[PDB]
Every structure is written in structure tokens, then in C-alpha cells.
Amino acid sequence: EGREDPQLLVRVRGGQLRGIRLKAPGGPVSAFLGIPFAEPPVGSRRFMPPEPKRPWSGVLDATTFQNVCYQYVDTLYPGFEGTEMWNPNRELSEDCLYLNVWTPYPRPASPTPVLIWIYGGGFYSGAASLDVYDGRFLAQVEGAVLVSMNYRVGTFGFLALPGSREAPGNVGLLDQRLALQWVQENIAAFGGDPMSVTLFGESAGAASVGMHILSLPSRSLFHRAVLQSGTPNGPWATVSAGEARRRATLLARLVGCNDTELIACLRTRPAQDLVDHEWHVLPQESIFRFSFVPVVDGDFLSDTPEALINTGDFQDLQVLVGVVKDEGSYFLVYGVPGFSKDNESLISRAQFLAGVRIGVPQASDLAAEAVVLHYTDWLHPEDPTHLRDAMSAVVGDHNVVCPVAQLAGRLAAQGARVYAYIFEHRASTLTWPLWMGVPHGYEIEFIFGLPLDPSLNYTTEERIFAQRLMKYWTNFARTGDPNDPSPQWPPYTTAAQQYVSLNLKPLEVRRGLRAQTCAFWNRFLPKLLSA
Ligand SMILES: *[C@@H]1O[C@H](CO)[C@@H](O)[C@H](O)[C@H]1NC(C)=O
Ligand SMILES: *[C@@H]1O[C@H](CO)[C@@H](O)[C@H](O)[C@H]1NC(C)=O
């Protein structure tokens, strides 16, 4: 301070910050990266609810991203951009509770609507610093204030001995909640409007947004929510207290460890030892299942998300939810034999039956038969191309498309204003093979407006498409309505079940989100599982 850029010095509750001026394609933006919002949850604080960060002295340098929360690093396809883009891009550390703010430059002179991003990655990975979550474009082009926070994942964020004091569960969700409290207190300092805060996230980040909707103390911290390909209901986003306890104690055993004693022993283990064993505690060979996720603790979650969306009053809530065209394909190449990014993955009937048992790992024999019966093409029951695509649909429908359907429906029936979409454009720059279609996670780079960066090699149409999506999302944040006061985007309702297609063509309205197949998963499967 003296010779420094006066536009980049800001004070928050904990002290003084110095940000950085970044170049976006249409002009500069302000970034404040690596702002601590919690005491490092290390040592005796592992597994504990986060504690608000204590004020610092001097000017904290906020010009670079901070550490990524310790996590498993995916190694299926080494050096291949398809997997690498999701991997940690800063040092892994338990000291990782930091958040990031982008704003116009100079800062808005009047209060601007805030978007808060929560990343996905199965509650076992992810980071707010990845290139695909870069807020410079939304800030520069839409004038948004954008916030994203790291939160603890894996065991560090989600290992629970329900009822204990030392490992109560859900602390990754409480990391997110603390960041939201930080926004309420401090965002006015950056030109943000704490009275207009829209949450958005994808996959597990979406489930997270969902859980904030369903958890009362989070409710006063935001006004609107966007759930991209993820929901708090469904088969992967939560586990019961019993199951959480069973996994935590199996994991303790695997690393050589009365809850207080078990937990103290876990606290002496190297971070990397926990990461090395976390995946071993799943009860069946699975895909789209994760070891350490939110637990129904009767605390953060007072009941299952199913019970809470069923009985909730959602009157003052606006919500944007949707899915990509091919939610399942991405997951098949990891753990279903016969699938691969490097060939067409034309599978046999035998491999379809086997993949159904992996895709629906909780299924009894009869339930699995029902799944196979429903997805088999009975004019061509052995055709490898249909079996390959049907396998994808099983996984995408069970895990994402049908839970989203159930969510939109319950939320509307109960007074929320809902807008639904299906995203159907495949990036021209996609490195996954064609058969995977428009895979899970590949809408994000358009919502954040990466196609605006000329060096990324997107097409001109893709550039205009990204601009449209950015408008929808920020209109929504701003007013609860994606429409600009072009074809209209009607609200989703139980009666008409309308949603739109997001692609290069103008909005097209459709009805029924896999209505027929989703009745199978949402109404019939549960009844069949008992017995
Ligand atoms: C594609 O590759 C996978 C793994 O290498 C293999 O199991 C599968 O059989 C291959 N597909 C065909 C039909 O060759
Ligand atoms: C974009 O295209 C140019 C020209 O071939 C190439 O040199 C550059 O590496 C490309 N960047 C990406 C990420 O595709």
C-alpha cells in the first residue's frame, strides 16, 4: 500500500486483503484467491466442525489459489485431459479451507447479486481452483460477484461415528455453511449483495446445494439455488447413520485403529493412509457410489432427504435444476467390464447383466431382473450397441435423471418455482469418444463461459451458446427467472412437467423428464426392494 493498485485492497472481518487484476477476454476483473474462512482443520481438529478463522495482522496476499483439500487422485487414464482437468491443481493439504472471490474491475458501485459455486467430485474429490470453475467470465461479462470455497472431502470431510462428539459427520457440509456465513458478513465489501445469494453446484456440489435447502440453519444464508446433475435425494448422496458407522469403523481397522479412542487413533494417521484405504469400505462392487458422504445424522439432516423433500414447505424458493444428455457414460469406463474410452465398448448381454449388478449394487436378484427387463430392447435383446447405450441409461437414470425428476416434482408440488433443463451439446473440444455422448460434468465449462477464451479453441457458435447460458444463469440469480424480460422457458410443474433443451438451437420446450422410466425407479423399484 502506497504504490499498489488502490482498486485491489479490501478489508474483511478477519483483516486486510490484497487481490489481483486478471485479464478476461473483454476486460479486467478483480480476483481475491485463497482467503481463509476457517482455522486449519488439522491435528486435533481433523473430523471436527470447522472453526471460524481468527483475524490476522497485516495485508493477507490473496493473489493465488490455496491448497486443495487432501484427496484421492484419479489415475485411470494418465495425462489424458478428459481425466486431468478434474485433478488437484495445487498442493494437497488438510490445511485447505479457503475461498475465492471474483468481481468486476473496478468493483461494482452498487450491490451485485452473488453466485456461490460448490464443486462436485463424489464428496471424495474436487477443488474450487480448477480451470473449469474460473469465475473471470461471469464476473467480466455478466457483472457477477462469484464465490467458490474449498470444503473437506473423503474421510476428512465425511467420516462419521454418528453421535460422537469428535466425528459427528457432515463436517464438509459445515465447511460449506461457514463459507456461506462468510459471504453474508463480508461480500458487501467487494460490492456483493448479501441479500441476493444464489447457490450453484454440480453433481455432489448439486447434492450439497440440495442439503442446504433442506437444512434450516443454511436457509437464511441464500435465496435461490441451482442443482446441476445432482440431488440430495437418490441412492448415492447420503448414507444412514448405521452405514456411516460401519464404514468409519472398517476404515479404522484397515489403518490399524469406544468412539473417543477409535477417533483419536484415526487422528494420528497420515492423511495419505486414510486416502489409501477409503475406497475399500464400500459394501458392494459399484459405480456411482462413494465411501464417505453426508450422513443422515438427525442434526444437519433431521431426516432422510426423501422424507424432507416430501414434507417440506418450499414456498419462498426458486430453483433451477437439470441434467446432461448422457449422465451415465462417464461412469461406465471406470468400473464396468467391457467399457473403455479407447474403443466403441460394444458389449454382450452377459456384460450388460453384470453391469446392471454393478450399477445397481443395492439390488436384490428380482430387482435387477426388473431393471434388465425394462432396459432390454426385446426386438434385439443381444444387440451390442443397444446394450451399451442401455447400460449408460441405467446408470444415468438411476443416479441422476430420475432423482432430479423426483426433486423437481416434489419441490413444485410444494410451492417452489422450478425451472428444468436437459443440456445436449457436446463440446467440439471433447476428448472422450463419441459413444459417450454428452457426458456428466461437460456442461460446466459452458455455464462458466470458457468458450469466450479464444485460446481454448471452441467454435464461434459455442461462444454464443456459452453467452446464452451465462445469461440464463445470471438472470436466474438476479430475479429467480432465467428468462430475459426469444422462446420462453416455462416453469416446471407437476401437471405439465415442462423443461427445455439447452443446445446450439433456440430453446425448445419438452414435457416429461423420462416420465415412464422414472416411474419405474421412483415409484416401483422401492416397493420391489422390499422384497
Ligand atoms: C474395449 O476395451 C476394453 C478394455 O480394454 C475391452 O474389455 C473391451 O472388450 C473392448 N471392446 C471390444 C468389443 O473389443
Ligand atoms: C488450439 O489450436 C492451436 C492450433 O493448432 C494449437 O496450437 C493449440 O495447442 C490449441 N489449444 C488447445 C487447448 O486445443
The domain that contains 531 carries what CATH number? 3.40.50.1820
Contacts of 433-438 with CB under 8 Å at 24 or more apart are: 433/341, 433/342, 433/343, 433/344, 435/329, 435/344, 435/345, 435/388, 435/389, 436/326, 436/329, 436/330, 436/333, 436/341, 436/392, 437/325, 437/326, 437/329, 437/392, 438/324, 438/325, 438/326
Pairing between β-strand 498-502 and β-strand 508-511 as defined by DSSP bridges: antiparallel
Question: Which burial class, exposed, middle or buried, applies to 261 when counting CB atoms under 10 A from its CB (0-12, 13-18, 19+)?
Answer: exposed
Is the CB of 44 within 6 Å of ligand 2?
no
Ligand 1 centroid from CA 350, angstroms: 14
Residue 330 makes CB contacts below 8 A (sequence gap 6+) with 432, 436, 439, 440, 441
Give residue 298 CA to ligand 2 midpoint distance, Å.
Answer: 51
- The DSSP symbol for 442 reads T
**Which among 345, 348, 382, 387 is the best mutation to test ligand 1's pocket, defined by most ligand atoms within 8 Å of the CB?**
345
Experimental approach: X-ray
CA 180, distance to chain mean position in Å, is 16
Among the bound ligands, name the one nearest to the CA of residue 343: 1
Residue 529 CB–ligand 1 contact under 6 Å: no
- Phi, psi dihedrals of residue 275, rounded to the nearest 5°: -60, -45
Distance CA 255, CA 226 (A): 38
CA 269 to chain centroid: 28
Q: What single letter denotes the amino acid at residue 301?
A: L
Q: How many CA atoms lie within 13 A of 213 on its CB side?
A: 33
Q: Tell how far the Cα of 437 is from the centroid of ligand 1, in angstroms.
A: 18
Q: What are phi and psi of 342, to 5 degrees?
A: -95, 5
The residue contributing the CA closest to ligand 2 atom 5 is 457
Q: How far is the CA of 339 from the centre of ligand 1 (A)?
A: 6
Q: Is 457 in the pocket of ligand 2 (CB under 6 A)?
A: yes
User: CA-CA distances (angstroms) from residue 13 to 32, 40, 183, 186?
Assistant: 15, 17, 11, 7
* Cβ of 428 less than 6 Å from ligand 2: no
Map residue 218 onto helix, strand or coil: helix
* CB 30 within 8 Å of CB 19: yes
Ligand nearest to the CA of 350: 1
User: Which long-range contacts does 375-378 make (Cβ < 8 Å, 24+ apart)?
Assistant: 376/352
DSSP H or E stretch at residue 267: helix 259-268
**Pocket-testing residue among 84, 85, 431, 457, ligand 2, by greatest number of atoms within 8 A of Cβ:** 457
C-alpha to C-alpha distance for 502 and 505, rounded to whole angstroms: 8
Coil vs helix vs strand at 276: helix
Position in ligand 2 atom list of the atom nearest CA 456: 13
Residue 75 CA to ligand 1 centre (angstroms): 19
Domains: count for the chain? 1
Phi, psi for residue 512 in degrees, rounded to 5: 80, 110
How far is CA 128 from each of CA 161, 212, 265, 382, 393, rounded to the nearest angstrom?
28, 18, 30, 44, 29
Grid cell for residue 412: 413444485
Q: Whose CA is nearest to atom 6 of ligand 1?
A: 338
CA of 347 relative to ligand 1 center, distance in Å:
8
| Ligand located closest to 450 CA | 2
Q: What is the CA 321 to chain-centroid distance, rounded? A: 12
Starting from the edge strand earliest in sequence, which strands make up the sheet with 27-36, in order? 20-24, 27-36, 98-104, 145-149, 112-118, 192-202, 224-228, 318-324, 417-423, 498-502, 508-511
Which residues neighbour 206 within 8 Å (Cβ) at sequence distance 6 or greater? Answer: 118, 120, 226, 227, 228, 229, 230, 231, 321
User: Of ligand 1's atoms, which has the minimum distance to the CA of residue 384?
Assistant: 13
Look at ligand 2, atom 4, and give the residue with the nearest C-alpha: 457
Q: Ligand nearest 431 Cα, by number? A: 2
Partners of residue 476 on adjacent β-strands? none
How far apart, in whole angstroms, are the C-alpha atoms of residue 264 and residue 69? Answer: 21
**Residue 167 near residue 267, CB atoms below 8 Å:** no
Cα gap 449→132, rounded to integer Å? 9
**Mutation pick for ligand 1 pocket among 340, 351, 385, 391 (CB with most ligand atoms within 8 Å):** 340
Give per-residue burial for 223-257: e unless 16+ CB within 10 Å, then b: bbbbbbbbbbbbbbbbbebebbbebbbebbeebeb
Phi, psi for 240 (deg, rounded to 5): -75, 170
Residue pair 172/159 in contact (Cβ under 8 Å)? The answer is no
Show the domain range for 433.
1-531
Distance (Å) from CA 457 to ligand 2 centroid: 6
Measured in Å, residue 337 CA sits from the centre of ligand 1 at: 8
Resolution (A): 2.2
**Ligand sitting nearest the alpha carbon of 453:** 2
Residues annotated as catalytic (active site), given as ranges: 203, 327, 440
User: How many whole angstroms separate alpha carbon 243 and alpha carbon 247?
Assistant: 6
Q: Which atom of ligand 1 is nearest to the CA of 337?
A: 7
Strand stretches in 62-128, DSSP E: 68-69, 92-93, 98-104, 112-118
Query: CA 56, CA 38: separation in Å to the nearest integer?
Result: 12
3-state secondary structure 152-206: CCHHHHHCCCCCCCCCCCCHHHHHHHHHHHHHHHHHHHHCEEEEEEEEEEECHHH
443 in the Ramachandran plot: left (φ > 0), alpha (ψ -120 to 50) or beta? Answer: alpha
Length of the chain: 531
Nearest ligand 1 atom to the CA of 339 is: 3
CB distance 340 to ligand 1 below 6 Å? yes
Write out the H or E segment, with its range, that includes residue 465. helix 460-479
Helices (H), 397-451: 402-413, 444-447
Q: How many CB atoms lie within 10 A of CB 452?
A: 20
